[PDB]
Structure formats: structure tokens, C-alpha cells
């Protein structure tokens, strides 16, 4: 029901720009197979060499965000397409299509072994990482150019990254220009900063080591996104970053039942803003001196 | 009985820092516990250094290096600067 | 400047810290600037904590600092 019928990809009548030996996520078949990614007039095509029927076509009009993640501290280089409308790849509906290539290579030839050979292997691995990053970056720029300015190439700011649990594993969440992302592990996180209405920091209280971050979207029909188990050392940094991005935040000692709150807000959004809107998240509005000391 | 606590000094410091803020009694108990704890830590480490180096006097160097051991980077730097400034001005005066 | 705190521009008691360092069985002798240095450090640390506690109490629209804000 939510699969919008897309236009047909228009093949390029000349020699297309191509990226070879790429894996796709989600995989259209249970078998992981390397493919070739092609740039065409109105989109990109992934094509497996083993079966012609496992083609994945992505139109430029349907890409919302285009990310490039280099292989610096990771073992893989990535080209991620976040989509406006979800695509059917094999049996899975997905908003996210990732193209990646793992540099992980086994190098020790298990004649002599000693500190010179290991240093040469480490140098060869660094050269391979830098070559793959240059190849994928150039190809991602060529995708942005082929879009006629419809798609900007985003690169994550690693220095502004923080650790957290949006799903079931602890992962490094990375800010970009316009989005908060995690692309390394599946399931992927892509939060567009402009779609956020408010951020709530849960379990901010003295003696806890970790807090949770909740994103509420402007579209109240969209479920809230939780990023759990953020180290408290990152709290003041996250508050600063939310302020620098013009996102309002609130803090609370307790985890809220967002699934009840969002249903109340959906039932009457007008009455919600009439009362005061998001002000109820600021703990208790006593507005009076505590004067606990006698 | 005259019991000793750092409450008046914390009031002084607070008014120096936040003139329009007040402290509860329990927060003052916590602050007193904190001050006593830090004093105990620093004096014990200074004694440990003095015994390690076969000395029988606690001078400002032992306290300085104790602060260097206990506090983390920025905190240690600022607290060392503050202490040296205060000791220098007390000596000068 | 009679009190040793004044001669050092401090708010914590130099004399009490001196007495506690002496009547505390830490070392045979005590310097003259060790109490001053320690009082300076303690005052600095308390100011450091009270700044952030005041910030947190002001973010909760409260005039009184409570254990929650610490």
C-alpha cells in the first residue's frame, strides 16, 4: 500500500560512469554478491553479474540524502542513499540503500617474518584504504553532478560523533550538515534535523552514568526516535549541538510514555498547543523559590 | 558544643558566584562532606609522598604534586594556577 | 590584614586548615604555604561546583540548590 509506483530509469546512451566490486544493503537475494553501480540520466542502477534479474534502480528524484562515509577507522567505505519513498528490494521494503566495499584483507603470508614485513603490510593496507576512499568519493561527487544540483554530497563530522544505542547495539552516531546518521551497522539511522520538532533528554539526574535522547518529529504520525545509553560526559556537548542546530530541548529525570503522549497530541493537536504545547516537558513549572533550608 | 563545618564559607563562595541563589541544608551537608573528603584525600596523599621520599614536612610542593595526581588535566591546570597565585600573593603580602 | 585568609585573599580559614594539618598526624612538620595552597584549591573547587549547580537550578527555575542540582 505504501509503495509508490516509480518512473522507469532512463539508460545513458553512451559509456556510463561505473563503480565495480560493490555490495548492496539490503541484499536483493539471500546470497551476498558483488555488483557494479552505474550512473544513468535520471538515476543510478546496481547490477549483479550473476543474475540480470537482481537489478536495483534508484531515481535521483527519490533520493532525499546522499552520504559518503570514508574508510578511516572502519573496515569499509560506503555510499548511502536515503529515499523519500520506500523501495521494494527483493522481499524487503526499505527507505535506505547502501553501497559498500570492505577493505578488510588478510595480509600475513602464513622465508622469514619480522618487523619490516608487518610495517609493509600496514603501509599496503593504508594505501588500499586511501585508494578506495578516493575512488568512492569521486564516484559520489559524479552522482551529485549527474543529478543537476538535486543532490548534495554529505560527509559525516567524525569529531562531533557520540556513542549511543538507537536499536540493540552501541554505535557511533555521526552528525552531518543536515542529518544525524549511523550507517555502519544495520538497521541504519537517518534523522533529518529539519524534521525534528523537539528533543527530550530522559534520565538526566544526579548519580546516573548515562541518559537517553528522544527526537519528536513535526509529523506527529511518525514514531519518535530513541537514542539510549548516551554517556553523561557527552550531555553538555549534545545540548550545545542541539542549540547550534536551532532544535529546542527539554530534560527530565523519568522516561516518558511517548506512545500515549503522541496519541493524545494526534487526537487534538490544536488543544495541545492552546494549553502550552511542549512546556509540560520542562519538569514542573513551580516558578517559586524552593527555600528548603530552614 | 561548637561543631565545625564549612557552611559559612560555602555561603560566602556562593554569594561570590551566584548572589541570587540559595542552598538547602542538605546540599550544605553534601558540600561539607565533599570538602572533608577532598581534604582527607589530599592530606593522605601528601603524607604518602613525604614518607616515600623520607621527608618529615609537608610543603606546598607535595600539595601541588598531589593536586597533579588527583585532578584531571584542565582541572589540575586551573587549580595549580590558582594555588600558586594565592601562595605567591600571600608570600608577597 | 590580620587573618591569614586576608593576607592570601581567600575565604576559607587558613588557621583551621593549619590546625587540622598539625593536629591530624600527617607529618612531623608542616610548611607555611601548604595550608594556603590547599585552601586556595578547595575554594576554587567549591566555586567550580557551585557555578554548575547554580546553572542547573536556574535551568529548573529554582532559587534554592538542592541535592538534585548537585
Amino acid at each position: 500500500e505504501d509503495v509508490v509506483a516509480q518512473a522507469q530509469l532512463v539508460e545513458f546512451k553512451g559509456r556510463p560512469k561505473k563503480l565495480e566490486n560493490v555490495f548492496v544493503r539490503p541484499a536483493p537475494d539471500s546470497k551476498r554478491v558483488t555488483g557494479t553501480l552505474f550512473i544513468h540520466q535520471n538515476g543510478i542502477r546496481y547490477q549483479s553479474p550473476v543474475r540480470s534479474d537482481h537489478r536495483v534502480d534508484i531515481l535521483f528524484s527519490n533520493i532525499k540524502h546522499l552520504f559518503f562515509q570514508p574508510c578511516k577507522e572502519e573496515l569499509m567505505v560506503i555510499i548511502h542513499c536515503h529515499l523519500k519513498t520506500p523501495l521494494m528490494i527483493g522481499k524487503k521494503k526499505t527507505f535506505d540503500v547502501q553501497f559498500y566495499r570492505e577493505v578488510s584483507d588478510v595480509t600475513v603470508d602464513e622465508y622469514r617474518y619480522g618487523d619490516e614485513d608487518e610495517l609493509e603490510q600496514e603501509q599496503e593496507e593504508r594505501r588500499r584504504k586511501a585508494l578506495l576512499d578516493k575512488e568512492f568519493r569521486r564516484f559520489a561527487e559524479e552522482i551529485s553532478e549527474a543529478s543537476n544540483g538535486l543532490l548534495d554530497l554529505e560527509t559525516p563530522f567524525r569529531e562531533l560523533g557520540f556513542t549511543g544505542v538507537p536499536f540493540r547495539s552501541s554505535v557511533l552516531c555521526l552528525p552531518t550538515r543536515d542529518c544525524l546518521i549511523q550507517l555502519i551497522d544495520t538497521p541504519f539511522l537517518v534523522v533529518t534535523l529539519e524534521e525534528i520538532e523537539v528533543a527530550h533528554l530522559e534520565r538526566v539526574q544526579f548519580g546516573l552514568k548515562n541518559f537517553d535522547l528522544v527526537f519528536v518529529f513535526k509529523d506527529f504520525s511518525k514514531p519518535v526516535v530513541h537514542i539510549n545509553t548516551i554517556p553523561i560526559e557527552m550531555l553538555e556537548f549534545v545540548k550545545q549541538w542541539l542549540t547550534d542546530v536551532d532544535i529546542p530541548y527539554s530534560e527530565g529525570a523519568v522516561n516518558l510514555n511517548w506512545g500515549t503522549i503522541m496519541k493524545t497530541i494526534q487526537a487534538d493537536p490544536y488543544e495541545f498547543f492552546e494549553n502550552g504545547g511542549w512546556s509540560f516537558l520542562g519538569g514542573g513549572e513551580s516558578d517559586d523559590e524552593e527555600s528548603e533550608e530552614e | 558544643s561548637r561543631k565545625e563545618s564549612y557552611s559559612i564559607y560555602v555561603y560566602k563562595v556562593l554569594k561570590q558566584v551566584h548572589p541570587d541563589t540559595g542552598i538547602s541544608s542538605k546540599a550544605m551537608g553534601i558540600m561539607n562532606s565533599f570538602v572533608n573528603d577532598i581534604f582527607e584525600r589530599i592530606a593522605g596523599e601528601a603524607s604518602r609522598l613525604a614518607h616515600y621520599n623520607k621527608r618529615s614536612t609537608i610543603t606546598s610542593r607535595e600539595i601541588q604534586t598531589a593536586v597533579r595526581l588527583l585532578l584531571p588535566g584542565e582541572l589540575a591546570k586551573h587549580a595549580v594556577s590558582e594555588g600558586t597565585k594565592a601562595v605567591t600573593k600571600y608570600t608577597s603580602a | 590584614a590580620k587573618t591569614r585568609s586576608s593576607r592570601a585573599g581567600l575565604q576559607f580559614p587558613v588557621g583551621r586548615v593549619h590546625r587540622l594539618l598539625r593536629k591530624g598526624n600527617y607529618s612531623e612538620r608542616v610548611g607555611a604555604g601548604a595550608p594556603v595552597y590547599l585552601a586556595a584549591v578547595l575554594e576554587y573547587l567549591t566555586a567550580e561546583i557551585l557555578e554548575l549547580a547554580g546553572n542547573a537550578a536556574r535551568d529548573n527555575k529554582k532559587t534554592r540548590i538542592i541535592p538534585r542540582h548537585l
Binding site: 542549540t243 536551532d246 529546542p248 512546556s279 | - | -
Partner: peptide, 26 residues
């Protein structure tokens, strides 16, 4: 520099942080 004037400066930048946050909620 001495630390008290930097914490005053940092906290005045934090008052601007709070003022921005108040403007964002309004």
C-alpha cells in the same frame, strides 16, 4: 588567563544558549 573570568565568559555564552533555547520554545 585565570579561570574565574573564563567560567564567567563560558556561562554568559551558556546564558545565550538558554536564551536561544527559550526563543526556540516560544
Amino acid at each position: 588567563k585565570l579561570r574565574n573570568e573564563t567560567t564567567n565568559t563560558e556561562e554568559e555564552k551558556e546564558r545565550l544558549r538558554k536564551e536561544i533555547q527559550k526563543q526556540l520554545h516560544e
